[model samples]
Target: ECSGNLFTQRTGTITSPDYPNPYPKSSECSYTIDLEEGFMVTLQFEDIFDIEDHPEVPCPYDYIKIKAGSKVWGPFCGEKSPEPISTQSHSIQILFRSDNSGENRGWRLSYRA
Candidate 1:
């Protein structure tokens, strides 16, 4: 389980809990970013690993949700890394989760404004 809050400015990095190595099963994590004025946060997923694609449901097992305030950019998962995301607000929040089934390397993400 991963849940907390963070505040940053200009640039920073965020990794899944125990990233590089496969993340533990049945996990949920949340991260938050606060950028300085005149800058918006740009998030890029350098390494994305999780349960593979599901033919039926989009990201049925594990995924990450990005939000700029209440506006959600979307949810992401699988082998295909998400494109770089920029927040309209100076603040954003990321929520990630995994199921009790398959496990894989998590993710190495960075942010800049």
Candidate 2:
């Protein structure tokens, strides 16, 4: 299913529908990471991070978005890997989407307590 997933582990990993292979042409996935109180979240992109992209806005077709409180990150895309991320909140929401055009191997992420 291209719907989504939930993660409650202190440390865990998440990946695209069929990672290392192209994801569905048009799909939407949202991931939620819920941690205990007083815990912060840290995230890293593995070796390969690929998504269909746009030249000016980074990702206009396929993109990943992170939401923590009122702050947000990404539309992250392409073959270039992103730097590690640390969040101030214990709860994180990750929303990923793909359009009908290009498809790539997708992305993999490591999240920690």
Candidate 3:
């Protein structure tokens, strides 16, 4: 269970394209989502910052999205997922562009982990 907006959490960091960047042709940010095991989860990315600041790529799931991001895959167990954490770490990828905005440019995340 998460508090606040259920979208933007003041804890996570952006590691895909790197902030204050000039838009890389190929770049992505990764977040380490900490959660308890045996929990159902779904990640969502809707509000986009500067589309040009970060590029675009395929999202991890049918619901995961960016300003215009597609779905990829997930709902995989943290015990088996790629992120190497004792708990769960759902890994996601996003291309870099410079048109995204920092304000209202985040996720609307909700999960049970």
Candidate 4:
């Protein structure tokens, strides 16, 4: 049976089983949850940018792995000033950081559909 009600979400970067180039830079991530009889669902990470997902760098930056369904959106923070996710369907969550260097930032993009 398919769940027409699809819950699309992005997870914290799953550490690559093979650290440093876990999956090909040319490769994208994806899965499907069968969305009802008429709908066969599958989601994929359309490699739009070149992000380095190695584990050595402890500092969080844009280099952080963006889960599938995320578009280049941010450089933002806090509950007061939340960045709009790439897709309107997605919501924002505020993360905390104690360091200044390479702080995790949300993104706002100037793009078209």
Candidate 5:
């Protein structure tokens, strides 16, 4: 399991805690890609994707979000994965959280600079 959020790698992979398995109940995680100045970060959820979400609502439970400078995308959840994001910003940040319950395999997040 990972606890740190700071990353400076040119390319890397990050996964939910105890990945390929359900993330723990009531959890919060943050991931950031800090590439060298003037380089962009492209992110994609390469493999399996699963997050808890109800049909009556839109990702109001466990979800993932993308942030870049002043721009924002997603608060995504459910069974489908978001599209690949190739950004113009030199840095990108991610937010992943789970509610108190629900058991579902999380995502395999990859980043390239």
Candidate 6:
């Protein structure tokens, strides 16, 4: 059940599915936030990330991917915080995926348009 996709024109917060705790493994979730035309959205991570670190490659397993228009940001994981992401379009899409490996507390983020 990969639900909870959102479309809005206001500021709000978005968190990984089952956040503040370890997310389920072997799952994929997505959320979309839409803003008024000509408006952009800003998303900032609120805490540390630890989504099955992949030392050799970035985000080999559990990861979060952010998409803004044609530009995509990451498959982010690990304890390091990510830079704030802003969209150039009126909407943005965020995707989270986990593999059948280890798990950790997902992520929490705030967003505004």
Error of 6 at 48 (Å): 2.8
How does each model score on lDDT?
0.78, 0.86, 0.28, 0.27, 0.86, 0.81
Q: Give the C-alpha miss distance for residue 79 in model 5, angstroms.
A: 0.7
The digit string of per-residue lDDT tens for model 5 on 1-113 reads 34449999888999888889889988788988888889988888867899999989889989888899989988888889889998887888898988898899998888888
- lDDT by residue for model 1 (1-113), tens: 57886867567788887887888788889888877666778888885545445888888888888988678965777777788887767878888888887767877778887
Q: Which rank order by TM-score, best down to worst?
A: 5, 2, 6, 1, 3, 4
In candidate 6, clashing pairs total: 0
Stretches of model 5 off by over 4 angstroms after superposition:
1-4
lDDT of 4 by residue, 46-82 (tens): 2222233226653333232222234433322222322
What is the lDDT for 101 in model 2?
A: 79
Residue runs of model 3 more than 4 Å from their true location after superposition: 1-22, 49-113
Q: Considering every candidate listed, which one attains the maximal TM-score?
A: 5
Q: Model 4: what TM-score?
A: 0.18
Which residue pairs show collisions in model 4?
2-36, 73-107, 74-106, 74-107, 74-108, 75-106, 75-107, 76-106
Tens-digit per-residue lDDT, 9-48, candidate 6: 5777777768778888787888988777888888889976
Q: Write the per-residue lDDT of candidate 2 for residues 1-113, one digit (tens) a residue.
A: 55658888889888888898888888889899898889999999996899888777767799888898898988788888878889888999998899997869999999998
Model 3 agreement with the true structure over 53-106: per-residue lDDT tens digits: 222443321112222124434322111212322222332332222222232122
lDDT of 5 at 91: 83
**Which of 3 and 6 is ahead in TM-score?**
6
All-Cα superposition RMSD per candidate: 1.8, 1.2, 12.6, 13.9, 1.4, 1.4
| lDDT score for residue 3 of model 5 | 43
lDDT winner between candidates 2 and 6: 2
- How does candidate 2 fare on TM-score? 0.93
Candidate 2 Cα RMSD (Å): 1.2
